[PDB]
Write a protein that binds this ligand. Structure first.
Ligand SMILES: Nc1ncnc2c1ncn2[C@@H]1O[C@H](COP(=O)(O)OP(=O)(O)OP(=O)(O)O)[C@@H](O)[C@H]1O
Ligand SMILES: [Mg+2]
Lengths: 48, 49, 121, 425
């Protein structure tokens, strides 16, 4: 399934977590390969 | 890269390599220190913590 | 590779030496080509499945690359493949059999081979 | 005396660099990028050591990885022929010259000698290693020590020495499975380790792919060479002896100076490269690459006999380093980086070559579709002009008449028909 990065940012900032941590986590997941970008980088999807 | 061609004076107060080498050898050969009890107790407390 | 080309030239020279002719002529070239092909043996295990998978991959990747817009779904892919075949199937029985076959092949590709990815609505 | 004047006159020519690039390896077809890189490798750079503390080498190492039949060894043979001091060795075994120093009684002269490895013998020279993957443990250890420390230590038979190994390393190798895999990184395709790969400034990948026109031309050259030797872009390459004299003169009397570098552009480009490398999420760039760029820049300034570095050499080194860095990435990352960095990679490029690449990609797609569906190829290949125009617009190119009239269009036996607005091959 797909999730928009803006949705994740909003959800975690409402929890008052820093945005840099979320960005780093997304980058690490990209390195591992679980997260992939769609045709537009606004929405990501999950692989394994 | 630019300054390597002209002057080996990057920092004002660098110790010359020969001087630094000789000074290190001098200090190593000359004397040898040991701790103090007042500092020793503080070190013990910090290590336990 | 190019080593096969050099081997072909050597075999042509060998044929010319055998027949004592003074030049390499197309008969020797044809014979060397024939022998080198007959020496090569094809692996036996399938071709139709691979061809269908390659066609599906080509279509999906062309869709992805040509547009920054939205893409199609599984039903759209099946309908597109059937529309393309339309000129190749003459009866309804063959059409429905091929539809079942392609649906099973697509399921195998998406779930077993993991080549194609599936997403929810 | 007059040779120096001839060298200066050749330097006065504005296109000496392209002449030198095309002068390398007359007997090998294609692989122009490899020849361009070998040009910088041969000409070299300049070591720098502020005081006796920070040593930075000027030798540009080259690594080649190729599928069988790509003629990797012929490049090494040519380099050995041209180079004034070049040593050749193979890692498979039974080499005429070893890769490790040892003390022994020579079989012929019957004398007690210290025979240093090929690395020591090539002081201020070139060392060539064939079959790089087949090397055993000792050879790998010695190569790592000689590349990272630039000195070889010996402790054998009561002899303790350190010897200088200021040499340039050029190596050739084959992939692990026997064929290069575009879906895997360079490190995953090669038996070597990451620390060894990190030493090399330039990495080249030679992948074999079935192109009918290129295969036809290569076969034509091979058969022509065989027939000739029976017992019974560049305007003109320089003579080999003239090239040798130019190389010697440039090495002896050319010392380019970096007193005109532009730090702002370099810093901005480095920041952007690191940013997008982290955005993709694999193999980020590091400062080392910049150093290589500078060295390559120096090499370019040594080609034109320039005593000072200008922006042209910097941009060419940028292009070379970016190509080397991108080519080692896997499919998706490589494609994204190539699309995003099209600004820098297009320095002194040819638009006609890019259009030819687009046409070849479209032709390959059509041929693959035909082979998969029909089960066999058709007698003709055709492609609409509209797709080519659209892709050129995507690359910001709006006119193609010069491409139609270009020699590259005719060389690949393409034709354009206005009666149908089509391209035929
Ligand atoms: N572009 C080319 N121009 C001329 N000859 C070529 C070219 N490509 C391949 N060859 C020829 O192909 C043959 C293959 O042998 P070669 O030693 O050059 O291979 P190699 O690439 O070193 O292979 P290996 O990976 O097995 O070590 C040689 O005779 C070489 O002349
Ligand atoms: Mg070889």
């Amino acid at each position: 399934s797909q999730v928009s990065e803006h949705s994740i940012i909003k959800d975690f900032t409402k929890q008052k977590y820093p945005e840099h941590a979320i960005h780093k986590v997304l980058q690490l997941m990209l390195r591992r390969g679980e997260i992939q970008h769609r045709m537009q980088r606004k929405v990501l999807y999950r692989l394994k | 890269h630019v300054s390597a061609l002209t002057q080996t004076q990057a920092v004002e107060g660098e110790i010359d390599l020969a001087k630094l080498k000789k000074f290190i050898a001098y200090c190593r050969v000359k004397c040898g220190p040991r701790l103090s009890a007042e500092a020793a107790e503080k070190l013990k407390n910090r290590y336990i913590i | 590779t190019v080593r096969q080309l050099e081997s072909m030239i050597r075999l042509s020279e060998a044929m010319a030496r055998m027949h004592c002719c003074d030049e390499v002529q197309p008969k020797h070239v044809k014979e060397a080509f024939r022998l080198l092909n007959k020496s090569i043996i094809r692996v036996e295990t399938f071709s139709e499945y691979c061809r269908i998978s390659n066609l599906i991959v080509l279509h999906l990747r062309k869709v992805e690359e040509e547009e920054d817009e939205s893409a199609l779904k599984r039903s759209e892919l099946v309908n597109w493949y059937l529309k393309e075949i339309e000129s190749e199937i003459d009866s309804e029985e063959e059409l429905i059999n091929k539809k079942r076959i392609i649906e099973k092949v697509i399921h195998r590709l998406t779930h077993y081979d993991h080549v194609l990815i599936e997403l929810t609505q | 005396d007059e040779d120096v004047k001839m060298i200066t006159s050749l330097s006065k020519d504005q296109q000496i660099g392209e002449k030198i690039f095309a002068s390398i390896a007359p007997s090998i077809y294609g692989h122009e990028d490899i020849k361009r890189g070998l040009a910088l490798a041969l000409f070299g750079g300049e070591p720098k050591n502020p005081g006796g503390k920070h040593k930075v080498r000027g030798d540009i190492n080259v690594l080649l990885c190729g599928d069988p039949g790509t003629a990797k060894s012929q490049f090494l043979k040519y380099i050995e022929k041209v180079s004034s001091r070049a040593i050749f060795t193979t890692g498979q075994g039974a080499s005429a010259v070893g890769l490790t120093a040892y003390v022994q009684r020579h079989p012929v002269s019957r004398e007690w000698t210290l025979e240093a490895g090929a690395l020591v013998l090539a002081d201020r020279g070139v060392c060539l290693i064939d079959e790089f993957d087949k090397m055993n443990d000792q050879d790998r250890t010695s190569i790592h020590e000689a590349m990272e420390q630039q000195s070889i230590s010996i402790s054998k038979a009561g002899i303790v020495t350190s010897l200088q190994a200021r040499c340039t390393v050029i190596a050739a190798a084959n992939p692990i499975g026997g064929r290069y895999d575009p879906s895997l990184t360079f490190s995953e395709n090669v038996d070597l380790t990451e620390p060894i790969i990190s030493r090399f400034d330039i990495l080249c990948v030679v992948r074999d792919t079935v192109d009918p026109v290129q295969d036809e031309m290569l076969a034509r050259f091979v058969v022509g060479s065989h027939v000739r030797h029976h017992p019974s872009y560049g305007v003109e390459p320089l003579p080999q002896e003239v090239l040798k004299k130019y190389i010697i003169y440039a090495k002896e009397r050319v010392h380019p100076k970096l007193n005109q570098m532009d730090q702002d552009k370099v810093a901005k480009m480095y920041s952007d490269l690191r940013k997008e490398s982290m955005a993709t999420g694999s193999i980020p760039i590091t400062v080392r690459h910049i150093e290589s760029m500078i060295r390559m820049a120096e090499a370019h300034a040594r080609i034109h006999l320039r005593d000072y570095v200008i922006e042209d050499d910097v941009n060419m080194a940028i292009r070379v380093m970016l190509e080397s860095f991108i080519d080692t990435q896997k499919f998706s990352v490589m494609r994204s980086m190539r699309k995003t960095f099209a600004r820098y990679l297009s320095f002194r490029r040819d638009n006609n070559e890019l259009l030819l690449f687009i046409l070849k990609q479209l032709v390959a797609e059509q041929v693959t579709y035909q082979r998969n569906r029909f089960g066999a190829q058709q007698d003709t290949i055709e492609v609409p002009e509209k797709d080519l125009v659209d892709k050129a617009r995507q690359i910001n190119i709006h006119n193609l008449s010069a491409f139609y009239d270009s020699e590259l269009f005719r060389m690949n036996k393409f034709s354009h028909d206005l009666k149908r607005k089509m391209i035929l091959q």
